Design a protein around this ligand. Sequence first.
Ligand SMILES: [Ca+2]
Ligand SMILES: [Ca+2]
Ligand SMILES: [Ca+2]
Length: 149
Amino acid sequence: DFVVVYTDGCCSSNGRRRPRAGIGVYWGPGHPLNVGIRLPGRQTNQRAEIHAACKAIEQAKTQNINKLVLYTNSMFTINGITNWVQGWKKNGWKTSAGKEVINKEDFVALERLTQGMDIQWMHVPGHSGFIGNEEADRLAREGAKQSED
RNA sequence: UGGCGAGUGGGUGAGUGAGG
DNA sequence: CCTCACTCACCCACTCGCCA
Ligand SMILES: [Ca+2]
Ligand SMILES: [Ca+2]
Ligand SMILES: [Ca+2]
């Protein structure tokens, strides 16, 4: 009934001068939907993690899939979409310190995708998961090595 | 009061740069 | 496995500064 997918977002030189952010998605051994692309827009790891998910819900919708089990090591991504967003719409998208929520654009994009979607968000220990997370990371790393389109 | 920018030190986890 | 240096961003909350 459900489908299991592994996503990762990386970023070479995160917070440095020339950051390169990539995303990776893993469905199955040699699954043709396995992808590792350079992330357009601002080059951060947090944006890569959110949009690495985003691409998974994107691809699942093109497969008439609505029940998803989504794996990512980003507690930022998981806690934001499952918790913080509801309070953010209520307080005008303001962090605990009163400043604007930086990745609002990415979280709005993510939730817009979760509509009509039944996703079970699951966390992976970044250094203790099995080959699903390990590979998905490798797709992200090699995706950040590419140029944009 | 509104706007803006730095911190403080606990939590969540992430992504890195340089070396053995 | 070991060592230095970071940022990305949020939760909890109380402090400095800047502008009307
Ligand atoms: Ca984008
Ligand atoms: Ca104030
Ligand atoms: Ca850490």
